[PDB]
Design a protein around this nucleic acid. Structure first.
Ligand SMILES: [Mg+2]
Ligand SMILES: [Mg+2]
Ligand SMILES: [Mg+2]
Ligand SMILES: [Mg+2]
Ligand SMILES: [Mg+2]
Ligand SMILES: [Mg+2]
Ligand SMILES: [Mg+2]
Ligand SMILES: [Mg+2]
Ligand SMILES: [Mg+2]
Ligand SMILES: [Mg+2]
Ligand SMILES: [Mg+2]
Ligand SMILES: [Mg+2]
Ligand SMILES: [Mg+2]
Ligand SMILES: [Mg+2]
Ligand SMILES: [Mg+2]
Ligand SMILES: [Mg+2]
Ligand SMILES: [Mg+2]
Ligand SMILES: [Mg+2]
Ligand SMILES: [Mg+2]
Ligand SMILES: [Mg+2]
Ligand SMILES: [Mg+2]
Ligand SMILES: [Mg+2]
Ligand SMILES: [Mg+2]
Ligand SMILES: [Mg+2]
Ligand SMILES: [Mg+2]
Ligand SMILES: [Mg+2]
Ligand SMILES: [Mg+2]
Ligand SMILES: [Mg+2]
Ligand SMILES: [Mg+2]
Ligand SMILES: [Mg+2]
Ligand SMILES: [Mg+2]
Ligand SMILES: [Mg+2]
Ligand SMILES: [Mg+2]
Ligand SMILES: [Mg+2]
Ligand SMILES: [Mg+2]
Ligand SMILES: [Mg+2]
Ligand SMILES: [Mg+2]
Ligand SMILES: [Mg+2]
Ligand SMILES: [Mg+2]
Ligand SMILES: [Mg+2]
Ligand SMILES: [Mg+2]
Ligand SMILES: [Mg+2]
Ligand SMILES: [Mg+2]
Ligand SMILES: [Mg+2]
Ligand SMILES: [Mg+2]
Ligand SMILES: [Mg+2]
Ligand SMILES: [Mg+2]
Ligand SMILES: [Mg+2]
Ligand SMILES: [Mg+2]
Ligand SMILES: [Mg+2]
Ligand SMILES: [Mg+2]
Ligand SMILES: [Mg+2]
Ligand SMILES: [Mg+2]
Ligand SMILES: [Mg+2]
Ligand SMILES: [Mg+2]
Ligand SMILES: [Mg+2]
Ligand SMILES: [Mg+2]
Ligand SMILES: [Mg+2]
Ligand SMILES: [Mg+2]
Ligand SMILES: [Mg+2]
Ligand SMILES: [Mg+2]
Ligand SMILES: [Mg+2]
Ligand SMILES: [Mg+2]
Ligand SMILES: [Mg+2]
Ligand SMILES: [Mg+2]
Ligand SMILES: [Mg+2]
Ligand SMILES: [Mg+2]
Ligand SMILES: [Mg+2]
Ligand SMILES: [Mg+2]
Ligand SMILES: [Mg+2]
Ligand SMILES: [Mg+2]
Ligand SMILES: [Mg+2]
Ligand SMILES: [Mg+2]
Ligand SMILES: [Mg+2]
Ligand SMILES: [Mg+2]
Ligand SMILES: [Mg+2]
Ligand SMILES: [Mg+2]
Ligand SMILES: [Mg+2]
Ligand SMILES: [Mg+2]
Ligand SMILES: [Mg+2]
Ligand SMILES: [Mg+2]
Ligand SMILES: [Mg+2]
Ligand SMILES: [Mg+2]
Ligand SMILES: [Mg+2]
Ligand SMILES: [Mg+2]
Ligand SMILES: [Mg+2]
Ligand SMILES: [Mg+2]
Ligand SMILES: [Mg+2]
Ligand SMILES: [Mg+2]
Ligand SMILES: [Mg+2]
Ligand SMILES: [Mg+2]
Ligand SMILES: [Mg+2]
Ligand SMILES: [Mg+2]
Ligand SMILES: [Mg+2]
Ligand SMILES: [Mg+2]
Ligand SMILES: [Mg+2]
Ligand SMILES: [Mg+2]
Ligand SMILES: [Mg+2]
Ligand SMILES: [Mg+2]
Ligand SMILES: [Mg+2]
Ligand SMILES: [Mg+2]
Ligand SMILES: [Mg+2]
Ligand SMILES: [Mg+2]
Ligand SMILES: [Mg+2]
Ligand SMILES: [Mg+2]
Ligand SMILES: [Mg+2]
Ligand SMILES: [Mg+2]
Ligand SMILES: [Mg+2]
Ligand SMILES: [Mg+2]
Ligand SMILES: [Mg+2]
Ligand SMILES: [Mg+2]
Ligand SMILES: [Mg+2]
Ligand SMILES: [Mg+2]
Ligand SMILES: [Mg+2]
Ligand SMILES: [Mg+2]
Ligand SMILES: [Mg+2]
Ligand SMILES: [Mg+2]
Ligand SMILES: [Mg+2]
Ligand SMILES: [Mg+2]
Ligand SMILES: [Mg+2]
Ligand SMILES: [Mg+2]
Ligand SMILES: [Mg+2]
Ligand SMILES: [Mg+2]
Ligand SMILES: [Mg+2]
Ligand SMILES: [Mg+2]
Ligand SMILES: [Mg+2]
Ligand SMILES: [Mg+2]
Ligand SMILES: [Mg+2]
Ligand SMILES: [Mg+2]
Ligand SMILES: [Mg+2]
Ligand SMILES: [Mg+2]
Ligand SMILES: [Mg+2]
Ligand SMILES: [Mg+2]
Ligand SMILES: [Mg+2]
Ligand SMILES: [Mg+2]
Ligand SMILES: [Mg+2]
Ligand SMILES: [Mg+2]
Ligand SMILES: [Mg+2]
Ligand SMILES: [Mg+2]
Ligand SMILES: [Mg+2]
Ligand SMILES: [Mg+2]
Ligand SMILES: [Mg+2]
Ligand SMILES: [Mg+2]
Ligand SMILES: [Mg+2]
Ligand SMILES: [Mg+2]
Ligand SMILES: [Mg+2]
Ligand SMILES: [Mg+2]
Ligand SMILES: [Mg+2]
Ligand SMILES: [Mg+2]
Ligand SMILES: [Mg+2]
Ligand SMILES: [Mg+2]
Ligand SMILES: [Mg+2]
Ligand SMILES: [Mg+2]
Ligand SMILES: [Mg+2]
Ligand SMILES: [Mg+2]
Ligand SMILES: [Mg+2]
Ligand SMILES: [Mg+2]
Ligand SMILES: [Mg+2]
Ligand SMILES: [Mg+2]
Ligand SMILES: [Mg+2]
Ligand SMILES: [Mg+2]
Ligand SMILES: [Mg+2]
Ligand SMILES: [Mg+2]
Ligand SMILES: [Mg+2]
Ligand SMILES: [Mg+2]
Ligand SMILES: [Mg+2]
Ligand SMILES: [Mg+2]
Ligand SMILES: [Mg+2]
Ligand SMILES: [Mg+2]
Ligand SMILES: [Mg+2]
Ligand SMILES: [Mg+2]
Ligand SMILES: [Mg+2]
Ligand SMILES: [Mg+2]
Ligand SMILES: [Mg+2]
Ligand SMILES: [Mg+2]
Ligand SMILES: [Mg+2]
Ligand SMILES: [Mg+2]
Ligand SMILES: [Mg+2]
Ligand SMILES: [Mg+2]
Ligand SMILES: [Mg+2]
Ligand SMILES: [Mg+2]
Ligand SMILES: [Mg+2]
Ligand SMILES: [Mg+2]
Ligand SMILES: [Mg+2]
Ligand SMILES: [Mg+2]
Ligand SMILES: [Mg+2]
Ligand SMILES: [Mg+2]
Ligand SMILES: [Mg+2]
Ligand SMILES: [Mg+2]
Ligand SMILES: [Mg+2]
Ligand SMILES: [Mg+2]
Ligand SMILES: [Mg+2]
Ligand SMILES: [Mg+2]
Ligand SMILES: [Mg+2]
Ligand SMILES: [Mg+2]
Ligand SMILES: [Mg+2]
Ligand SMILES: [Mg+2]
Ligand SMILES: [Mg+2]
Ligand SMILES: [Zn+2]
Lengths: 48, 59, 118, 116, 112
RNA sequence: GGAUGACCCCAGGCGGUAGGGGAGCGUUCCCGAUGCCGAUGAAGGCCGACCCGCGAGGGCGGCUGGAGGUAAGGGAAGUGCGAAUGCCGGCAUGAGUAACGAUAAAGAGGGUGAGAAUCCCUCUCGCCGUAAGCCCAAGGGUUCCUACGCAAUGGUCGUCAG
RNA sequence: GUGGAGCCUGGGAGUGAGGGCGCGAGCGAUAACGUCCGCGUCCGAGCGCGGGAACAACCGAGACCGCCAGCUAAGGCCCCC
RNA sequence: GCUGGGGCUAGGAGUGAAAAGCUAACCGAGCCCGGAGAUAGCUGGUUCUCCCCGAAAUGACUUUAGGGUCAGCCUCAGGCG
RNA sequence: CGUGAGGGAAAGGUGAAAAGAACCCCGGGAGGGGAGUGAAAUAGAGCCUGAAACCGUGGGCUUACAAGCAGUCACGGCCCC
RNA sequence: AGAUGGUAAGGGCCCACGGUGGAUGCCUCGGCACCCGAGCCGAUGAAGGACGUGGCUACCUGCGAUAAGCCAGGGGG
């Protein structure tokens, strides 16, 4: 049957993207937290 | 059914006892009257190609 | 049980089994000698002997009968004109089966050759 | 500082497993099972050290009895005579006499009949 | 004098090959060759190679005579197992052990 | 008894769960140590039917190992495991057992190759055909084409392959 | 009456589900391997030893270690024994 | 009526032709991280050796009754004798 | 691994020195046997030490009329010192 | 009529030697604690990144189309 993951490049970028995170105080804290942890990717990689 | 399951681990003795019937029987072979090579009986000899006196097959 | 029952099943349904025999017949009559599994081989003898025996008749009826299984006019021409004649004085037994010594690698199947007799 | 297990536990298990040589299956190969088997073994040895003394005395008595009835009395009567005679040779030696030195045993029997 | 060959890390399960090995232990090189040739087992292929390599070692390196060689000793040891995943129902994942053999053949000389 | 813990003599006590008390063994570390043991072999490992200790243990001997170890007397603790449906790892049992993923289906001949039911070619047979054919868009991201390969991936095989 | 008696002052507890049996009662049905008290006992903790065929609490008896020595206890002495 | 694409509404909140249904395969109150080693009068588990002693499962009170405080019973030190 | 916030591993050691095994032999290869290096190669790269569970080969004793928590006590047979 | 042996398909105990596996000892390129030193960066575009950059270059490091580097001072030999 239809499962839960239904890939969409637009949806992905608009939801979890860098610009989306910078718009919101909570999203900026995500970027802060991940940078401090030393994540190689602050934001879900996606192709456009 | 209700999923039967082994109640106790089989001992090394009991596992090996089961396998007391597992030994291979060696292949039964006979000499080919033409080339004296060893081959299973009632088969065309795979070495010279002879069976029942005559050449039957190209080896 | 299986009491006094004749005929292998060879793990095929009715129409597949028929095809199997018909195809093996075409191949045997074509090359004079083929290699199969022992069971297929032992079962092919009767099927082909009958076809040969009908070619020995020669008439139109026999030709159209054999044509039901062999289906190929040229192959049947070969049957009547070149194969059948050399068995004019032979009373059945137009085929022989001899077993090979080596089994198939991939499944251990014992093999045998089936050939038309001299 | 830190005192990790290190060498100690292996050595302790090794001690037990050695004591368990000859045992069946895991009872000689698995520490846990060996230790359990050894508990039983230790109690048996203690208890059977105690019963060995019973076991032999019982055997001696059976043997003395056989030797007595050859001379027309039973063990009970024989021992009572010996008591009245004041012959304090124990049942270990009495049984030995009965087999090895029948003439001496025959003599002792007479003494026992007489003391009656 | 003895000659040995080992085939290490053979991708076959020990319990299987040993069946084949057991057939040739103690036998003459010639009989061992004939047996393996008509033994309907995958293992026959591997055991035969070790046999033949050991025979070569005997003749070429150890000054032993081919016409006198017999299988003095043979055995199979377990090598490291290749662990692989077998997917089952209801999201459960099992582990298949694709096992491995170390095959050893030791040849001696049958005098007299 | 002798002089006090030397050892001897006589006598009595000495089942034991919760629990109280006492005396010891071993582990890591510090002073002892600018020392001492050590390649004529450290620690660790594997044996021992030997010695000492009630015991925990401590010696000694042989093999392994190949660079550390550490006394008498004291000091300090991440100090002793058999169980926690404990944790991590390794390996067993079930077992050569169930299974190898739609019952659309196969057979032969000829190539290749160390090796072929499984790769290539040919003939015969079967299945789909509002599809199991073709063309887009999502998504996937070199999977495309050719050469050279078969350890692993492929539920078998493999010379073939996403 | 010198005993792992007793008293006094302190340190540390554990226990605060008991159970069977005997005797004396209540409850129950002059029932329960029942329930609730009293006196004692044993098991608990003596599932260590002998007897009771086997069997925590019935009979015998309180196991520091060793002995191929002796006497007994309950219970036994036709064979198993 | 079904359906693609683009959007909006969420945790005591959303959405619901109402089943406490659904809100990323467990929703009578989502998930992640944090408070956090919450708390657990409950269950489990608790590691070397030898030596001496050695209980209790009762009473009173207890939102107490399978938990406690005091007493009783065990042990150690000093004192009395 | 998770849409995401977020969760989050495993995995060190040849030898003094690569001197990391020319060349030959069996093999398609892998692997091995000689040769060679080294104080040492069961230090050979799947490399220091190399315990245990687990699997196997060889040898000693033993087992197909026997009743079991697998031991213990006694005696006898065989094998070894 | 009597009695007593060798059998091992296989199993068990012990011994030897292996395989597997990676405990233990030794080791330390790492970590932990305390103490002391030191303490802001950014529109002159930071922190942190993307894509690039080598004769042959997967990754890491370095660097930025002047790209494992350009200029000058100092050190060093
Ligand atoms: Mg459906
Ligand atoms: Mg649908
Ligand atoms: Mg996903
Ligand atoms: Mg998923
Ligand atoms: Mg959709
Ligand atoms: Mg899109
Ligand atoms: Mg969208
Ligand atoms: Mg965005
Ligand atoms: Mg701000
Ligand atoms: Mg955000
Ligand atoms: Mg990541
Ligand atoms: Mg990065
Ligand atoms: Mg993000
Ligand atoms: Mg059903
Ligand atoms: Mg089982
Ligand atoms: Mg078992
Ligand atoms: Mg077991
Ligand atoms: Mg079983
Ligand atoms: Mg075995
Ligand atoms: Mg012939
Ligand atoms: Mg039927
Ligand atoms: Mg018939
Ligand atoms: Mg039939
Ligand atoms: Mg038919
Ligand atoms: Mg078939
Ligand atoms: Mg079938
Ligand atoms: Mg049909
Ligand atoms: Mg028809
Ligand atoms: Mg031809
Ligand atoms: Mg037809
Ligand atoms: Mg055949
Ligand atoms: Mg064959
Ligand atoms: Mg195959
Ligand atoms: Mg055959
Ligand atoms: Mg520990
Ligand atoms: Mg043992
Ligand atoms: Mg034994
Ligand atoms: Mg004991
Ligand atoms: Mg005793
Ligand atoms: Mg005695
Ligand atoms: Mg006695
Ligand atoms: Mg008397
Ligand atoms: Mg007397
Ligand atoms: Mg005599
Ligand atoms: Mg096999
Ligand atoms: Mg075996
Ligand atoms: Mg065979
Ligand atoms: Mg040769
Ligand atoms: Mg499945
Ligand atoms: Mg699924
Ligand atoms: Mg398993
Ligand atoms: Mg497995
Ligand atoms: Mg394996
Ligand atoms: Mg005394
Ligand atoms: Mg005392
Ligand atoms: Mg006493
Ligand atoms: Mg005591
Ligand atoms: Mg210790
Ligand atoms: Mg000091
Ligand atoms: Mg020093
Ligand atoms: Mg010196
Ligand atoms: Mg040495
Ligand atoms: Mg140390
Ligand atoms: Mg030490
Ligand atoms: Mg000792
Ligand atoms: Mg010792
Ligand atoms: Mg020593
Ligand atoms: Mg040593
Ligand atoms: Mg040495
Ligand atoms: Mg040094
Ligand atoms: Mg402490
Ligand atoms: Mg600790
Ligand atoms: Mg414990
Ligand atoms: Mg379970
Ligand atoms: Mg269970
Ligand atoms: Mg747990
Ligand atoms: Mg554990
Ligand atoms: Mg596990
Ligand atoms: Mg089977
Ligand atoms: Mg079964
Ligand atoms: Mg079955
Ligand atoms: Mg099946
Ligand atoms: Mg399938
Ligand atoms: Mg399946
Ligand atoms: Mg199928
Ligand atoms: Mg089918
Ligand atoms: Mg072909
Ligand atoms: Mg060619
Ligand atoms: Mg060819
Ligand atoms: Mg193939
Ligand atoms: Mg092939
Ligand atoms: Mg073909
Ligand atoms: Mg197929
Ligand atoms: Mg149709
Ligand atoms: Mg149509
Ligand atoms: Mg249709
Ligand atoms: Mg696209
Ligand atoms: Mg993908
Ligand atoms: Mg081209
Ligand atoms: Mg492959
Ligand atoms: Mg392959
Ligand atoms: Mg292959
Ligand atoms: Mg390759
Ligand atoms: Mg495969
Ligand atoms: Mg598959
Ligand atoms: Mg190709
Ligand atoms: Mg392709
Ligand atoms: Mg008094
Ligand atoms: Mg007292
Ligand atoms: Mg008292
Ligand atoms: Mg007091
Ligand atoms: Mg007190
Ligand atoms: Mg205290
Ligand atoms: Mg309490
Ligand atoms: Mg209470
Ligand atoms: Mg109470
Ligand atoms: Mg009560
Ligand atoms: Mg009461
Ligand atoms: Mg009481
Ligand atoms: Mg009772
Ligand atoms: Mg009375
Ligand atoms: Mg009454
Ligand atoms: Mg009553
Ligand atoms: Mg009553
Ligand atoms: Mg009472
Ligand atoms: Mg209790
Ligand atoms: Mg009792
Ligand atoms: Mg008492
Ligand atoms: Mg009982
Ligand atoms: Mg009793
Ligand atoms: Mg009794
Ligand atoms: Mg008496
Ligand atoms: Mg009496
Ligand atoms: Mg009487
Ligand atoms: Mg009697
Ligand atoms: Mg719409
Ligand atoms: Mg829509
Ligand atoms: Mg959308
Ligand atoms: Mg909520
Ligand atoms: Mg919340
Ligand atoms: Mg609401
Ligand atoms: Mg989720
Ligand atoms: Mg859901
Ligand atoms: Mg709630
Ligand atoms: Mg959910
Ligand atoms: Mg947070
Ligand atoms: Mg708090
Ligand atoms: Mg609370
Ligand atoms: Mg006492
Ligand atoms: Mg009370
Ligand atoms: Mg009461
Ligand atoms: Mg109140
Ligand atoms: Mg209550
Ligand atoms: Mg409570
Ligand atoms: Mg109190
Ligand atoms: Mg006092
Ligand atoms: Mg006093
Ligand atoms: Mg995912
Ligand atoms: Mg992802
Ligand atoms: Mg290593
Ligand atoms: Mg080195
Ligand atoms: Mg080095
Ligand atoms: Mg070659
Ligand atoms: Mg060659
Ligand atoms: Mg090839
Ligand atoms: Mg090579
Ligand atoms: Mg080599
Ligand atoms: Mg040399
Ligand atoms: Mg040298
Ligand atoms: Mg030396
Ligand atoms: Mg070598
Ligand atoms: Mg070595
Ligand atoms: Mg070594
Ligand atoms: Mg070494
Ligand atoms: Mg070293
Ligand atoms: Mg090693
Ligand atoms: Mg190893
Ligand atoms: Mg080992
Ligand atoms: Mg053996
Ligand atoms: Mg009988
Ligand atoms: Mg017998
Ligand atoms: Mg028996
Ligand atoms: Mg029993
Ligand atoms: Mg016995
Ligand atoms: Mg006796
Ligand atoms: Mg006999
Ligand atoms: Mg045997
Ligand atoms: Mg056998
Ligand atoms: Mg080993
Ligand atoms: Mg290893
Ligand atoms: Mg150290
Ligand atoms: Mg440091
Ligand atoms: Mg400052
Ligand atoms: Mg930057
Ligand atoms: Mg770079
Ligand atoms: Mg410059
Ligand atoms: Mg410069
Ligand atoms: Mg300069
Ligand atoms: Zn021939």
């Amino acid at each position: 049957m239809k499962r839960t993951w239904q890939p969409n490049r637009r949806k992905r970028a608009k939801t979890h993207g860098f610009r989306a995170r910078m718009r919101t105080p909570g999203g900026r804290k995500v970027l802060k937290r991940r940078r401090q942890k030393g994540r190689w990717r602050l934001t879900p990689a996606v192709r456009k | 059914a209700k999923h039967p399951v082994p109640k106790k681990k089989t001992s090394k003795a009991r596992r090996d006892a089961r396998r007391s019937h597992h030994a291979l029987t060696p292949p039964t072979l006979v000499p080919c009257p033409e080339c004296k090579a060893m081959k299973p009986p009632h088969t065309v000899c795979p070495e010279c190609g002879y069976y029942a006196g005559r050449k039957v097959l190209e080896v | 049980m299986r009491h006094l029952k004749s005929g292998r099943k060879l793990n095929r349904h009715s129409s597949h089994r028929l095809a199997l025999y018909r195809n093996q017949a075409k191949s045997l009559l074509t090359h004079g000698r083929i290699t199969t599994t022992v069971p297929k081989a032992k079962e092919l003898r009767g099927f082909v002997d009958h076809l040969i025996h009908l070619a020995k008749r020669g008439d139109l009826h026999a030709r159209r009968l054999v044509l039901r299984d062999l289906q190929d006019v040229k192959l049947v021409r070969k049957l009547f004109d070149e194969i059948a004649p050399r068995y004019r004085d032979r009373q059945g037994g137009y085929t022989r089966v001899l077993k090979l010594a080596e089994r198939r690698r991939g499944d251990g199947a014992p093999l045998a050759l089936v050939e038309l007799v001299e | 500082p830190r005192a990790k297990t290190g060498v100690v536990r292996r050595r302790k298990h090794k001690k037990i497993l050695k004591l368990a040589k000859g045992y069946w299956g895991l009872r000689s190969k698995s520490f846990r099972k060996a230790r359990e088997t050894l508990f039983a073994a230790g109690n048996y040895a203690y208890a059977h050290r105690k019963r060995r003394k019973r076991d032999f005395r019982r055997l001696w008595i059976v043997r003395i009895n056989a030797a007595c009835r050859q001379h027309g009395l039973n063990y009970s009567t024989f021992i009572h005579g010996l008591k009245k005679a004041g012959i304090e040779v124990d049942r270990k030696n009495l049984a030995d006499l009965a087999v090895r030195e029948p003439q001496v045993f025959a003599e002792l029997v007479e003494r026992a009949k007489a003391a009656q | 004098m003895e000659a040995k060959a080992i085939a290490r890390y053979v991708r076959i399960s020990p319990r299987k090959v040993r069946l084949v090995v057991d057939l040739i232990r103690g036998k003459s090189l010639e009989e061992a060759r004939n047996i393996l040739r008509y033994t309907n087992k995958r293992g026959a292929y591997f055991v035969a190679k070790v046999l033949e390599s050991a025979a070569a070692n005997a003749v070429n390196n150890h000054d032993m005579l081919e016409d006198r060689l017999y299988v003095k000793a043979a055995y199979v040891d377990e090598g490291p197992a290749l662990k692989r995943v077998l997917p089952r129902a209801r999201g459960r994942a099992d582990i298949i052990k694709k096992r491995t053999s170390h095959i050893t053949v030791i040849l001696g000389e049958k005098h007299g």
